[PDB]
Amino acid sequence: TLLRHEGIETVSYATQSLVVANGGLGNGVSRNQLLPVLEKCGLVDALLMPPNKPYSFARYRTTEESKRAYVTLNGKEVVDDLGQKITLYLNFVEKVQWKELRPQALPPGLMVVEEIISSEEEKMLLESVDRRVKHFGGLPDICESFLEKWLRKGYIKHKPDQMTINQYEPGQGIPAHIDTHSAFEDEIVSLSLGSEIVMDFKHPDGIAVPVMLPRRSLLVMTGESRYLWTHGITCRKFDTVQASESLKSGIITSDVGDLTLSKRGLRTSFTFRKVRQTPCNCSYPLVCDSQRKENLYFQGLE
Ligand SMILES: O=C(O)CCC(=O)C(=O)O
Ligand SMILES: [Mn+2]
Ligand SMILES: [Zn+2]
């Protein structure tokens, strides 16, 4: 399913150990949560839960008990610290090992302009609007002033003709996705204000880059970062960041310094896109609705 990119080898025969997909700490599943469910099938000799991973490893005393878990727990639902439902998927593993990845680069074509606006400029926009969502496109002069500067500065190359307002509350976010190709051009920028947050960007092949969007920052995503990748916001109330560069934006790597968590706040976003007139024709037909419009096969795959 995903374990492929994760470097986890699975076998088709019963074994004492098995990987538990979606049963990891990085998914919101606690040891006090999973361990009980696991023991319900046998004597759990070990529950290995690697940090920041959407999975954990379980090992039973006998290979028979393990098979019981594989056939009874597979598909079982559990509630994370986010008060959400998540199904578990177990698989037999001969050995317990996985790959650790630490992206050093933002998805190509993505860039976060820090302190794009001032404090008063932030306060203003916030008190001039009134999961909460709001569409446009049209564009209120309230920002026609800013956009103009955006272009001159060079941060943006095209003036948008549509804008969406998103207001997220501590806990709520938005599931991963990719803005429609045939709907907007190759340039979608997003101004985050009120309270910093962490946007997740994922590549189909497997790469996972958790980008931290600070307040008063303009996330501009173009190219691959806007056509192939996928942006989302894990619904949580606490984001983990690096001690020093906590307020700074970028990739939140680990093992390079002491780590500390931060509480979320009422974040409001202003996404700007230019509605496309022609049909999209990028280099990513795997996700481009326009380029795969007339393909019975793709159609079947919905
Ligand atoms: O939260 C953001 O800044 C991204 C906006 C977004 O995902 C959308 O509404 O299409
Ligand atoms: Mn979006
Ligand atoms: Zn496309």
Swiss-Prot record:
Q: Where is this chain's protein located in or outside the cell?
A: Cytoplasm; Nucleus
Transmembrane intervals = none
What positions does the domain Fe2OG dioxygenase occupy? 159-276
- What region holds the RRM domain? 16-93
Q: Which domain of life is it from?
A: Eukaryota
Provide the binding site for Zn(2+).
Answer: 181, 280, 282, 288
Instruction: Give me the residues that bind Fe cation, please.
Output: 177, 179, 231
Tissue-specificity statement:
Widely expressed, with highest expression in spleen, followed by pancreas and lung.
Induction section of the entry: Up-regulated after DNA damage. Induction is mediated via ATM.
Function text = Catalyzes the methylation of 5-carboxymethyl uridine to 5-methylcarboxymethyl uridine at the wobble position of the anticodon loop in tRNA via its methyltransferase domain. Catalyzes the last step in the formation of 5-methylcarboxymethyl uridine at the wobble position of the anticodon loop in target tRNA. Has a preference for tRNA(Arg) and tRNA(Glu), and does not bind tRNA(Lys).
Q: Which family does it belong to?
A: Belongs to the alkB family.
Disease linked to the protein: Intellectual developmental disorder, autosomal recessive 71: A form of intellectual disability, a disorder characterized by significantly below average general intellectual functioning associated with impairments in adaptive behavior and manifested during the developmental period. MRT71 features include impaired intellectual development, global developmental delay, mildly delayed walking, poor language, seizures in the first years of life, and behavioral abnormalities.
Q: How does it assemble?
A: Interacts with TRMT112.
What protein name is recorded for this chain? tRNA (carboxymethyluridine(34)-5-O)-methyltransferase ALKBH8
Organism of this sequence: Homo sapiens
Which lineage is the organism of this entry classified under, starting from the top rank? Eukaryota, Metazoa, Chordata, Craniata, Vertebrata
Report where the shown chain sits in the full-length sequence: first residue, last residue, total length.
28 to 355 of 664
